[PDB]
């Protein structure tokens, strides 16, 4: 009947051709419009084999978001493979619009509607669509924003839990607000605010689920070990101006009987960064007197397990990120491309 295949998909979006927004601009070409009648076809009682970590769709979306950024975000100068280039860096509007991924005639996407499913193995409630759903290409570190949500319980995805060089995606069944502000009247100084009471509820249940995977083992959160500020800081984006957030106050082992509320963590803009599109560094300009502000939905955490838990009785976990494919893996887990007649 049907068969696993790696075809070339196309993108669909509810873009607007008039708006000069980078996302609308890039999605006005490369994408087609958008299906107003997306046909979902419940596969009777079939059972299929998914694997979110060997999914070609992630590589195709990776390429798309790559080509979105380094063709529509203007870098003052980029330094990479033994070369330096010059360009103009005009400031732009920036808001990620949902992108649907679509199979050409001769192919369909199988979809998993298993309420609690960790992107590997059997599915059971197999469905079939000719296009994925509204997936905002939100590029972030340590925290996934404006993404999907686990229908029922918190889910824990990892290609191999015993391999601690693999990233852990934790998929929340509860959205969390994150208000990040770059006021008017220091220039580069931003701050971020998150309902501490609400937030600590989520974390408590996240540690409880993580404990479920680890035979009742004491769960510890520690700030990231070392490396490029892009992974040690929750580094996301706002109105084209890259923020960098210190999440140490966030993963607070104490605040788990009294504690408090409004958690306020530092965060700051950067003009030089490390491109995620390739190994290299990138020059950019500062803002201009605007009250730069984004609210975002926390929908998951990028985590890393240590390797001194062969002893003790406590497993430590550190904020992660940097592998941007993983962001795309957190939304493309329930899909896989299949070839029919």
């Amino acid at each position: 009947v049907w068969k696993d295949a790696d075809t070339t998909l196309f993108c669909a979006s509810d873009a607007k051709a008039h708006e000069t927004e980078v996302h609308n601009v890039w999605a006005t070409h490369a994408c087609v419009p958008t299906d107003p009648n997306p046909q979902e076809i419940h596969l009777e009682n079939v059972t299929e084999n998914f694997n979110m970590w060997k999914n070609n769709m992630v590589e195709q979306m990776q390429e798309d978001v790559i080509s979105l950024w380094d063709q529509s975000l203007q870098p003052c100068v980029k330094l990479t493979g033994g070369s330096v280039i010059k360009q103009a860096c005009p400031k732009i509007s920036f808001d990620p619009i949902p992108i649907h991924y679509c199979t050409p005639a001769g192919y369909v996407i199988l979809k998993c509607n298993d309420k609690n499913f960790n992107g590997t193995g059997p599915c059971k409630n197999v469905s079939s669509v000719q296009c994925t759903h509204g997936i905002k290409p939100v590029v972030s570190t340590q925290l996934l924003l404006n993404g999907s949500l686990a229908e029922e319980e918190i889910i824990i995805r990892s290609e191999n839990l015993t391999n601690n060089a693999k990233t852990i995606i934790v998929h929340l069944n509860k959205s969390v607000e994150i208000n990040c502000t770059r006021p008017s009247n220091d220039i580069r100084k931003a701050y971020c605010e998150i309902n501490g009471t609400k937030w600590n509820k989520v974390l408590k249940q996240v540690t409880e689920k993580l404990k479920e995977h680890f035979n009742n083992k004491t769960i510890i959160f520690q700030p990231p070990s070392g490396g490029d500020l892009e992974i040690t800081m929750h580094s996301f984006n706002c109105r084209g101006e890259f923020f960098y957030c210190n999440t140490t106050q966030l993963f607070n082992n104490t605040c788990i009987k009294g504690c408090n509320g409004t958690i306020t963590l530092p965060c700051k803009i950067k003009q030089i960064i490390n491109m995620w599109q390739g190994t290299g560094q990138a020059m950019y300009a500062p803002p201009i007197d605007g009250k730069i502000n984004c609210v975002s939905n926390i929908t998951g955490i990028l985590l890393t397990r240590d390797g001194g838990a062969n002893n003790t009785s406590n497993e430590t976990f550190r904020p992660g990120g940097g592998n941007i494919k993983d962001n795309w893996r957190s939304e493309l887990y329930k899909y896989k491309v299949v070839q029919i007649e």
């Epitope: 087609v32 107003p36 046909q39 679509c102 001769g106 000719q130």
Partner: antibody
């Protein structure tokens, strides 16, 4: 097997509304959408709109939305079509059509067409 | 987005000749393109779907080819029966846009 039967040919006056019908058979009228296409005087085909029987949500081409209204009666397996504020320009043949009968996605090409309904807009 | 441009809008060949109709799109749309023959005062009859795939019950002298934004219906050994009008349509989703059509007459 599968069959689509429209209403009888009609006549209306410059702005009057017209309600064409389309009684399907040979398939479970639930699962498959119903599409409306029209052919004017010495012109080509022009897709008008799509209608879903299971939901009742409808979409139209920009040239027609505001004037076309598609409804449905699941019990008689009959899709309806309704045009308002007509012109000498709207004198045309109206077909209903529907996709090939299959479970899989990607088969939304019109295999089954109606016999067509001529609608003369004239005083 | 998504504009289909069908050419020519008129064609004249003789029985046994080989004719070629062309459809050209703005952007790609995953080859959800069907070819219809509407015979003089008849109903449309989908000859070709999925860009290149032949619909059973129609002769094999009708073929579709091309991909992305360049498609072509070729009628290899033309016959008198084929005197009709041919349209290309997209069916990835709404709006299932039609081409402008191609009247085909026969020299004899």
């Amino acid at each position: 097997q599968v069959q689509l039967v429209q209403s009888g040919a009609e006549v209306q006056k410059p702005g009057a509304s017209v309600k064409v019908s389309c009684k399907a058979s040979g398939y479970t009228f639930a699962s498959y959408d119903i599409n409306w296409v029209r052919q004017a005087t010495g012109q080509g085909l022009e897709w008008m709109g799509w209608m879903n029987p299971k939901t009742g949500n409808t979409g139209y081409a920009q040239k027609f939305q505001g004037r076309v209204t598609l409804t449905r009666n699941t019990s008689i397996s009959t899709a309806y079509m309704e045009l308002t504020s007509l012109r000498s320009e709207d004198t045309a043949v109206y077909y209903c059509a529907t996709y090939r009968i299959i479970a899989a996605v990607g088969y939304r090409y019109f295999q089954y067409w109606g016999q067509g309904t001529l609608v003369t807009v004239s005083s | 987005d998504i504009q289909l441009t069908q050419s020519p809008s008129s064609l004249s060949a003789s029985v046994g000749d080989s004719v070629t109709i062309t459809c050209r799109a703005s952007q790609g749309f995953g080859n959800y393109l069907a070819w219809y023959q509407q015979r003089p005062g008849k109903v449309p009859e989908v000859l070709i779907y999925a860009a290149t795939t032949l619909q059973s019950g129609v002769p094999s002298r009708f073929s579709g080819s091309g991909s992305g934004t360049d498609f072509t219906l070729t009628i290899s050994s033309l016959q008198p029966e084929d005197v009709a009008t041919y349209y290309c349509q997209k069916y990835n989703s709404a709006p299932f846009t039609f081409g402008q059509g191609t009247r085909l007459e026969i020299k004899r």
